Symmetry: C2
Protein backbone atom coordinates (compact mmCIF):
# COMPACT_ATOMS: atom_id res chain seq x y z
CA UNK A 1 0.00 0.00 0.00
CA UNK A 2 0.99 3.61 0.71
CA UNK A 3 0.21 5.55 -2.44
CA UNK A 4 2.81 8.15 -3.40
CA UNK A 5 0.63 9.87 -5.98
CA UNK A 6 -2.35 12.01 -5.01
CA UNK A 7 -5.22 12.69 -7.46
CA UNK A 8 -5.65 16.45 -7.39
CA UNK A 9 -8.79 16.21 -9.57
CA UNK A 10 -11.19 15.70 -6.66
CA UNK A 11 -9.53 18.61 -4.86
CA UNK A 12 -9.95 21.10 -7.71
CA UNK A 13 -13.29 22.19 -9.31
CA UNK A 14 -11.45 23.21 -12.48
CA UNK A 15 -9.99 19.72 -12.82
CA UNK A 16 -13.40 18.23 -12.08
CA UNK A 17 -14.70 19.83 -15.27
CA UNK A 18 -11.82 18.41 -17.29
CA UNK A 19 -12.32 14.93 -15.88
CA UNK A 20 -16.09 15.08 -16.35
CA UNK A 21 -15.76 16.23 -19.95
CA UNK A 22 -13.26 13.43 -20.50
CA UNK A 23 -15.63 10.78 -19.21
CA UNK A 24 -18.47 11.96 -21.44
CA UNK A 25 -16.11 11.59 -24.41
CA UNK A 26 -14.44 8.33 -23.43
CA UNK A 27 -17.58 6.42 -22.50
CA UNK A 28 -19.21 7.56 -25.72
CA UNK A 29 -16.16 6.49 -27.71
CA UNK A 30 -15.60 2.96 -26.43
CA UNK A 31 -17.14 0.07 -28.46
CA UNK A 32 -18.44 -1.67 -25.33
CA UNK A 33 -20.65 1.23 -24.25
CA UNK A 34 -24.01 1.59 -26.02
CA UNK A 35 -26.01 4.82 -26.13
CA UNK A 36 -28.79 4.02 -23.64
CA UNK A 37 -26.31 2.55 -21.21
CA UNK A 38 -24.06 5.59 -21.65
CA UNK A 39 -26.97 7.75 -20.46
CA UNK A 40 -26.68 6.47 -16.90
CA UNK A 41 -22.89 6.36 -16.87
CA UNK A 42 -22.48 9.98 -17.98
CA UNK A 43 -25.37 11.07 -15.75
CA UNK A 44 -24.00 9.46 -12.58
CA UNK A 45 -20.44 10.56 -13.32
CA UNK A 46 -21.35 14.22 -13.81
CA UNK A 47 -22.94 14.27 -10.35
CA UNK A 48 -19.75 13.15 -8.61
CA UNK A 49 -17.58 15.71 -10.41
CA UNK A 50 -20.13 18.43 -9.62
CA UNK A 51 -19.63 17.57 -5.96
CA UNK A 52 -15.95 18.29 -6.55
CA UNK A 53 -17.03 21.64 -7.97
CA UNK A 54 -18.35 22.47 -4.50
CA UNK A 55 -15.26 21.23 -2.64
CA UNK A 56 -13.79 23.82 -0.34
CA UNK A 57 -12.58 23.68 3.24
CA UNK A 58 -10.44 21.45 5.46
CA UNK A 59 -12.76 18.52 4.77
CA UNK A 60 -12.14 18.73 1.02
CA UNK A 61 -9.51 16.00 1.35
CA UNK A 62 -11.96 13.57 2.93
CA UNK A 63 -14.62 14.56 0.39
CA UNK A 64 -12.13 13.88 -2.39
CA UNK A 65 -11.47 10.41 -1.00
CA UNK A 66 -15.18 9.72 -0.56
CA UNK A 67 -16.03 10.93 -4.06
CA UNK A 68 -13.21 8.78 -5.40
CA UNK A 69 -14.79 5.60 -4.05
CA UNK A 70 -18.35 6.86 -4.59
CA UNK A 71 -17.59 7.35 -8.29
CA UNK A 72 -16.16 3.86 -8.65
CA UNK A 73 -18.93 2.33 -6.54
CA UNK A 74 -21.93 3.86 -8.30
CA UNK A 75 -20.57 3.39 -11.83
CA UNK A 76 -19.56 -0.23 -11.22
CA UNK A 77 -22.76 -1.16 -9.34
CA UNK A 78 -24.87 0.33 -12.13
CA UNK A 79 -22.78 -1.35 -14.83
CA UNK A 80 -22.85 -4.82 -13.23
CA UNK A 81 -26.64 -4.80 -12.84
CA UNK A 82 -27.46 -3.90 -16.45
CA UNK A 83 -24.68 -6.05 -17.94
CA UNK A 84 -26.47 -9.37 -17.41
CA UNK A 85 -24.86 -9.78 -13.97
CA UNK A 86 -22.08 -11.98 -15.30
CA UNK A 87 -21.15 -10.09 -18.46
CA UNK A 88 -20.30 -6.88 -16.60
CA UNK A 89 -16.59 -7.62 -17.05
CA UNK A 90 -17.07 -7.10 -20.80
CA UNK A 91 -17.56 -3.37 -20.30
CA UNK A 92 -15.51 -3.12 -17.10
CA UNK A 93 -12.32 -3.55 -19.14
CA UNK A 94 -13.18 -0.42 -21.12
CA UNK A 95 -14.51 1.52 -18.12
CA UNK A 96 -11.28 1.13 -16.16
CA UNK A 97 -9.33 2.21 -19.23
CA UNK A 98 -11.38 5.37 -19.70
CA UNK A 99 -11.17 6.27 -16.01
CA UNK A 100 -7.40 5.76 -15.83
CA UNK A 101 -6.89 7.57 -19.14
CA UNK A 102 -8.93 10.55 -17.97
CA UNK A 103 -6.85 10.71 -14.80
CA UNK A 104 -3.76 10.85 -17.02
CA UNK A 105 -5.21 13.68 -19.05
CA UNK A 106 -6.66 15.62 -16.12
CA UNK A 107 -4.41 15.08 -13.08
CA UNK A 108 -1.35 14.05 -15.07
CA UNK A 109 -1.13 10.64 -13.42
CA UNK A 110 -2.79 7.23 -13.28
CA UNK A 111 -3.59 7.26 -9.55
CA UNK A 112 -3.25 3.63 -8.34
CA UNK A 113 -5.47 4.40 -5.35
CA UNK A 114 -8.59 4.83 -7.49
CA UNK A 115 -8.33 1.52 -9.34
CA UNK A 116 -7.52 -0.23 -6.05
CA UNK A 117 -10.78 1.11 -4.62
CA UNK A 118 -12.58 -0.17 -7.73
CA UNK A 119 -11.21 -3.73 -7.46
CA UNK A 120 -12.21 -3.83 -3.81
CA UNK A 121 -15.77 -2.74 -4.57
CA UNK A 122 -16.23 -5.15 -7.50
CA UNK A 123 -15.76 -8.09 -5.15
CA UNK A 124 -18.55 -7.10 -2.74
CA UNK A 125 -20.86 -5.81 -5.49
CA UNK A 126 -20.73 -8.97 -7.61
CA UNK A 127 -21.17 -10.93 -4.36
CA UNK A 128 -24.86 -10.11 -4.43
CA UNK A 129 -25.71 -12.43 -7.30
CA UNK A 130 -27.75 -14.55 -4.95
CA UNK A 131 -30.91 -13.09 -6.46
CA UNK A 132 -32.40 -16.60 -6.81
CA UNK A 133 -34.80 -15.53 -4.05
CA UNK A 134 -37.72 -15.87 -6.46
CA UNK A 135 -40.65 -17.24 -4.46
CA UNK A 136 -41.94 -19.35 -7.32
CA UNK A 137 -40.39 -22.59 -6.07
Amino acid sequence: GAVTAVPSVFSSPNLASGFLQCLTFGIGNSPAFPTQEQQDLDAIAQVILNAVSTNTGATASARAQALSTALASSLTDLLIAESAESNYNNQLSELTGILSNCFIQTTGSDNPAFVSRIQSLISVLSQNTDVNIISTA
Copy 2:
Protein backbone atom coordinates in the same frame (compact mmCIF):
# COMPACT_ATOMS: atom_id res chain seq x y z
CA GLY B 1 -32.57 -16.64 0.91
CA ALA B 2 -34.55 -13.51 1.70
CA VAL B 3 -37.18 -11.75 -0.38
CA THR B 4 -35.70 -8.43 -1.44
CA ALA B 5 -38.00 -5.44 -1.02
CA VAL B 6 -37.21 -2.19 -2.82
CA PRO B 7 -37.26 0.95 -0.61
CA SER B 8 -39.51 3.56 -2.20
CA VAL B 9 -37.15 6.29 -0.98
CA PHE B 10 -34.90 5.59 -3.99
CA SER B 11 -37.88 5.60 -6.35
CA SER B 12 -39.46 8.80 -5.04
CA PRO B 13 -37.68 12.20 -5.09
CA ASN B 14 -40.19 13.42 -2.50
CA LEU B 15 -39.01 10.65 -0.18
CA ALA B 16 -35.39 11.24 -1.14
CA SER B 17 -35.75 14.83 0.03
CA GLY B 18 -37.56 13.63 3.16
CA PHE B 19 -34.76 11.16 3.87
CA LEU B 20 -32.32 14.07 3.75
CA GLN B 21 -34.68 15.95 6.08
CA CYS B 22 -34.11 13.07 8.48
CA LEU B 23 -30.35 12.82 8.09
CA THR B 24 -29.83 16.52 8.72
CA PHE B 25 -31.69 16.17 12.02
CA GLY B 26 -30.43 12.74 13.05
CA ILE B 27 -26.74 13.42 12.47
CA GLY B 28 -27.03 16.76 14.25
CA ASN B 29 -28.66 14.99 17.19
CA SER B 30 -25.94 12.38 17.66
CA PRO B 31 -23.23 12.94 20.34
CA ALA B 32 -20.56 11.36 18.14
CA PHE B 33 -20.80 13.99 15.42
CA PRO B 34 -19.46 17.53 15.83
CA THR B 35 -21.38 20.45 14.35
CA GLN B 36 -18.75 20.76 11.61
CA GLU B 37 -18.54 17.09 10.72
CA GLN B 38 -22.34 16.90 10.78
CA GLN B 39 -22.77 19.62 8.18
CA ASP B 40 -20.15 17.98 5.96
CA LEU B 41 -21.93 14.64 6.22
CA ASP B 42 -25.21 16.34 5.31
CA ALA B 43 -23.47 18.02 2.37
CA ILE B 44 -22.20 14.68 1.06
CA ALA B 45 -25.42 12.78 1.75
CA GLN B 46 -27.59 15.28 -0.13
CA VAL B 47 -25.54 14.59 -3.27
CA ILE B 48 -26.85 11.03 -3.37
CA LEU B 49 -30.44 12.08 -2.66
CA ASN B 50 -30.21 14.67 -5.44
CA ALA B 51 -29.18 11.81 -7.70
CA VAL B 52 -32.23 9.88 -6.50
CA SER B 53 -34.27 12.97 -7.30
CA THR B 54 -32.95 12.89 -10.87
CA ASN B 55 -34.05 9.27 -11.31
CA THR B 56 -36.00 9.43 -14.52
CA GLY B 57 -35.87 6.90 -17.32
CA ALA B 58 -35.98 3.16 -17.93
CA THR B 59 -32.81 2.44 -15.98
CA ALA B 60 -33.89 4.52 -12.98
CA SER B 61 -34.48 1.25 -11.13
CA ALA B 62 -30.82 0.27 -11.38
CA ARG B 63 -29.80 3.79 -10.40
CA ALA B 64 -31.69 3.34 -7.14
CA GLN B 65 -29.55 0.27 -6.49
CA ALA B 66 -26.25 1.94 -7.36
CA LEU B 67 -27.12 5.04 -5.34
CA SER B 68 -27.83 2.80 -2.36
CA THR B 69 -24.25 1.54 -2.53
CA ALA B 70 -22.93 5.03 -3.24
CA LEU B 71 -24.68 6.45 -0.17
CA ALA B 72 -23.13 3.85 2.12
CA SER B 73 -19.76 4.31 0.41
CA SER B 74 -19.46 8.10 0.44
CA LEU B 75 -20.73 8.62 4.00
CA THR B 76 -18.46 5.93 5.45
CA ASP B 77 -15.45 7.04 3.38
CA LEU B 78 -15.88 10.66 4.49
CA LEU B 79 -16.20 9.46 8.07
CA ILE B 80 -13.15 7.15 8.11
CA ALA B 81 -10.91 9.79 6.53
CA GLU B 82 -11.59 12.46 9.18
CA SER B 83 -11.26 9.90 11.98
CA ALA B 84 -7.69 8.80 11.29
CA GLU B 85 -8.93 5.52 9.76
CA SER B 86 -8.82 4.07 13.25
CA ASN B 87 -11.29 6.19 15.23
CA TYR B 88 -13.99 5.80 12.57
CA ASN B 89 -15.56 2.94 14.53
CA ASN B 90 -16.70 5.41 17.21
CA GLN B 91 -18.81 7.51 14.85
CA LEU B 92 -19.52 4.57 12.52
CA SER B 93 -21.68 3.04 15.24
CA GLU B 94 -23.89 6.14 15.25
CA LEU B 95 -23.90 6.80 11.50
CA THR B 96 -25.13 3.31 10.63
CA GLY B 97 -27.94 3.71 13.15
CA ILE B 98 -29.06 7.10 11.84
CA LEU B 99 -29.20 5.77 8.29
CA SER B 100 -31.35 2.76 9.20
CA ASN B 101 -33.52 4.89 11.50
CA CYS B 102 -34.12 7.32 8.65
CA PHE B 103 -35.02 4.39 6.39
CA ILE B 104 -37.44 3.25 9.08
CA GLN B 105 -39.14 6.63 9.16
CA THR B 106 -38.88 7.57 5.49
CA THR B 107 -39.55 4.29 3.67
CA GLY B 108 -40.78 2.24 6.61
CA SER B 109 -38.09 -0.43 6.82
CA ASP B 110 -34.68 -1.27 8.24
CA ASN B 111 -33.34 -2.03 4.77
CA PRO B 112 -31.29 -5.21 5.47
CA ALA B 113 -29.58 -4.86 2.09
CA PHE B 114 -28.25 -1.37 2.82
CA VAL B 115 -26.73 -2.29 6.18
CA SER B 116 -25.22 -5.42 4.62
CA ARG B 117 -23.72 -3.26 1.86
CA ILE B 118 -22.30 -0.94 4.53
CA GLN B 119 -20.54 -3.79 6.34
CA SER B 120 -19.27 -5.16 3.03
CA LEU B 121 -17.84 -1.74 2.17
CA ILE B 122 -16.24 -1.61 5.62
CA SER B 123 -14.26 -4.67 4.59
CA VAL B 124 -12.76 -2.67 1.71
CA LEU B 125 -12.66 0.78 3.31
CA SER B 126 -10.74 -0.52 6.31
CA GLN B 127 -8.47 -2.62 4.08
CA ASN B 128 -6.28 0.27 2.99
CA THR B 129 -5.21 3.67 4.29
CA ASP B 130 -5.51 6.60 1.88
CA VAL B 131 -6.16 9.74 3.95
CA ASN B 132 -2.43 10.22 4.56
CA ILE B 133 -0.89 8.99 1.33
CA ILE B 134 -1.13 12.54 0.01
CA SER B 135 1.98 13.66 -1.82
CA THR B 136 1.27 17.26 -2.77
CA ALA B 137 4.80 17.72 -4.07
